Amino acid sequence: AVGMSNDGRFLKFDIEIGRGSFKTVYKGLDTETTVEVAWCELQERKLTKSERQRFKEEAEMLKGLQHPNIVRFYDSWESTVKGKKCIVLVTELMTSGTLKTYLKRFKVMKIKVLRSWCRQILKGLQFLHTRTPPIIHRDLKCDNIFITGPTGSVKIGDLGLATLKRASTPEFMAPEMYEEKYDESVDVYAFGMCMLEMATSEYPYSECQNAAQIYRRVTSGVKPASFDKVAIPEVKEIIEGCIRQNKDERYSIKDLLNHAFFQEE
């Protein structure tokens, strides 16, 4: 009832599911399955053809991803209502909110939950990293890790959005990223900051008053003050391994998965 795939696969409805960054999520339907989906539009966007092709190629690889800890990506394309331009992404419908919304709601997390969810995130990342070629997310944060609800597992999401960003408050990022340098280890750094935020229910570097201060500290290897508040020894140890200044000296994902913390539960 308003939009439809060029084939006829997915339909769009007028129900809003919420907002991200002027990116509005409509409710949708996959007729081929009778499964409800997320119908995503980025309100007003466009760019160049090499960049366009780059998105198109990478996007096509997303459609072939199937993993329990990754949000399923269905399809994408550009459109112009009147009027307004946008990119449309169709993804698995996640209704049960994010880590970010969870933390904002409760402001505390049990250790058993943190262990299980952090393992799931690592398994997601390792799946992406060991595609051919590797997929680096490069924009991991609490507000694009989604909770399922059935089984209350987590999935990494906004793969389409991340691809767009890669094709070309915003934030702190690993030190190398300030020099637009990255490999797999940028996702490890982001993991570490996600785990810190889960363990403390604080946004890292909240003591800093401007980006510049954060830049200075991050590139210096000066840790956020919230690091000092972590109460669980093994969690603190894991976070420290992940947010080391030199990307080459950080824990690998294999290192992390093999940590005793995750052998506990």
Author numbering: 211 to 378, 386 to 482
Provide the publication's sentences verbatim.
With No Lysine (WNK) kinases are soluble intracelluar serine–threonine kinases noted for their unique active site and their association with familial hyperkalemic hypertension (FHHt). WNKs are the chloride-inhibited protein kinases long anticipated to control the activity of cation chloride cotransporters in response to osmotic stress. WNKs are activated by osmotic stress in cells and are inhibited by chloride. A model for WNK regulation, then, is the presence of a dimer–monomer equilibrium: the dimer is inactive and binds inhibitory ligands; the monomer is autophosphorylation-competent.
